[PDB]
Amino acid sequence: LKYICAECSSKLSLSRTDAVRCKDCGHRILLKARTKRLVQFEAR
Amino acid sequence: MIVPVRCFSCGKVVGDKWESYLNLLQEDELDEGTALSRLGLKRYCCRRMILTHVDLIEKFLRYNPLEKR
Amino acid sequence: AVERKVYPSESRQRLTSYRGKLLLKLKWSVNNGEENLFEVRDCGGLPVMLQSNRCHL
Ligand SMILES: [Zn+2]
Ligand SMILES: [Zn+2]
Question: CB contact, 8 Å: A4 with chain B?
Answer without folding.
Answer: yes
